[PDB]
Design a protein around this ligand. Structure first.
Ligand SMILES: Nc1ncnc2c1ncn2[C@@H]1O[C@H](COP(=O)(O)OP(=O)(O)NP(=O)(O)O)[C@@H](O)[C@H]1O
Ligand SMILES: Nc1ncnc2c1ncn2[C@@H]1O[C@H](COP(=O)(O)OP(=O)(O)NP(=O)(O)O)[C@@H](O)[C@H]1O
Ligand SMILES: Nc1ncnc2c1ncn2[C@@H]1O[C@H](COP(=O)(O)OP(=O)(O)NP(=O)(O)O)[C@@H](O)[C@H]1O
Ligand SMILES: Nc1ncnc2c1ncn2[C@@H]1O[C@H](COP(=O)(O)OP(=O)(O)NP(=O)(O)O)[C@@H](O)[C@H]1O
Ligand SMILES: [Mg+2]
Ligand SMILES: [Mg+2]
Ligand SMILES: [Mg+2]
Ligand SMILES: [Mg+2]
Lengths: 142, 142, 142, 142
């Protein structure tokens, strides 16, 4: 049975809606195991300003909260309880997505292109890197 | 529902992986699958005095030759005859693909990342452009 | 006389070193005006965790600090005092870089590709978007 | 110092902007400027039974024709004869460019984004690949 990785930005509503049907259809093929991953971004820029368990809340705290929101989001998908798993990481979202894709390993990554906006973007920062560097199939959802 | 599957006739030995994705996606819905091959037309060759119906063959004969090869490829897929259509175009492959996706319109484009090649998991020129510019979901198959 | 935009991530040392010579050579042509821009990233993800002049320091504060570090960095370039200007913004670095490129308007953007790392990146998140969407020439420094 | 300037002979009417960038970059240093044109070789055409020295002309004659056109283009640049070299290759233009950049090696590649075209400021297929994969600095001219 295949493995599908579904990266979720917990701050995105519309994106999460569009991937739901795709994720559901994809898992109904092969009875796939679906792994959801949300990544707490860590910015060098903020570090360089001095903003660190100090001016920013504890990482253990942030993770529990992110994980909490991810599990709320996973309830929006019709997937067998036995086939789903939630993951939280910290770092560059693209690197951690790609790392998780190597770790599982993933047969497919399902990822939204970019938040809907009035800019003329192609792919988002993270979608483009995943598409480019993943070693498995990537479904870019629009 | 409409799936567009671009085919480069010089990669006739498709992976089971690509065939499998298309068959599976088509089964999810009652989807029509449109296959498209594009005869590339190069300004560089025009600049060298290589013109259609002169030192290159007539475009119509090239179209028929391409379409004939596409039809042999289409049959590799286990799809009902009434849910499959063959298209041949000429020009810039990325732009004709994107044009077709817009015309139909496609709900999904299924495209191989790159011909099997041990050097890279990176996208080829057409895959990269299609993933970037399609207005619909794009599955990049590896 | 032309206008050159030089985006600076204040947390990057190596990148800033490599662009120095390019920026200097480029400005010696045309006696260009050189505008430096550093952008305080604002992350939806952090907002969605609750982290806002509250759990994160005042934006006025962050800006003064970023601007301070930018001016320290601008001292590493041999440019006429009359030809340089420092800017700070807040938001998506790529959007604000691109906006500044439209606002000046910029004749050239000089931007490092990506921090040197042992990952096999092509361009960074922001370099790629600038390259892709800027309406002027872009010098991608490596 | 070595500058590589890829030339597509079917865009012979270069912008003053491209010529200006190359001249200026070469003057900064005492730089040698290598110009390269690549005769594209398409698997798709091979698949249609179009082979060199049969239904296409001999590669040597195509090489000589291309080189002759390149040399006329090279002369548009105001460069000293001893700091300029012409190269013709055959195959995938993006890969031969990148190969040349590696071989020389190039300290900089100067490349137009795309032929002048009112539809887009986005990169063409070769420019995009070259900016992404060159190991050296790349100036994308618009
Ligand atoms: N922290 C994360 N965890 C999991 N997935 C993520 C994360 N961040 C981004 N992604 C994935 O990649 C996409 C991000 O795109 P988005 O943030 O809209 O582009 P952007 O960076 O705003 N581009 P632009 O508007 O051009 O400046 C989302 O759909 C996610 O699925
Ligand atoms: N003429 C065409 N008609 C239809 N589809 C095409 C055409 N050309 C390319 N494609 C699609 O896009 C993919 C081709 O990219 P590909 O040629 O494999 O890599 P590449 O450009 O050679 N890159 P590299 O070899 O890394 O330098 C194929 O799987 C096709 O689905
Ligand atoms: N806040 C900013 N202000 C100004 N310029 C910026 C800013 N952020 C990024 N840039 C520019 O774009 C580059 C960012 O690349 P970088 O952060 O190394 O890639 P990345 O996102 O870590 N990629 P990866 O390692 O593949 O996950 C820098 O050289 C800057 O010049
Ligand atoms: N055969 C070649 N030899 C040398 N350089 C080349 C060659 N082909 C392309 N290039 C370089 O890359 C640029 C070409 O990209 P271009 O063909 O203008 O856009 P495109 O691929 O047609 N994209 P679009 O028209 O947007 O769908 C040129 O300025 C050249 O410098
Ligand atoms: Mg994002
Ligand atoms: Mg190809
Ligand atoms: Mg960065
Ligand atoms: Mg071209």
């Amino acid at each position: 049975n295949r493995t599908i990785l579904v990266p979720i930005d917990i701050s995105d509503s519309e994106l999460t809606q569009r991937v739901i049907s795709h994720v559901e259809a994809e898992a109904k093929i092969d009875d796939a195991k679906v792994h959801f991953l949300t990544v707490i971004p860590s910015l060098p820029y903020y570090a360089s300003l001095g903003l660190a368990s100090a001016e920013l809340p504890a990482m253990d705290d942030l993770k529990a909260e992110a994980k909490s929101q991810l599990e709320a989001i996973i309830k929006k998908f019709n997937l067998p309880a036995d086939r789903v798993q939630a993951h939280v990481a910290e770092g560059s979202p693209k690197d951690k997505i790609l790392e998780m894709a190597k770790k599982l390993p993933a047969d497919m990554v399902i990822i939204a292109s970019h938040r809907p906006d009035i800019t003329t973007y192609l792919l988002g920062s993270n979608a483009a890197a995943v598409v480019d560097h993943a070693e498995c199939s990537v479904l870019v959802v629009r």
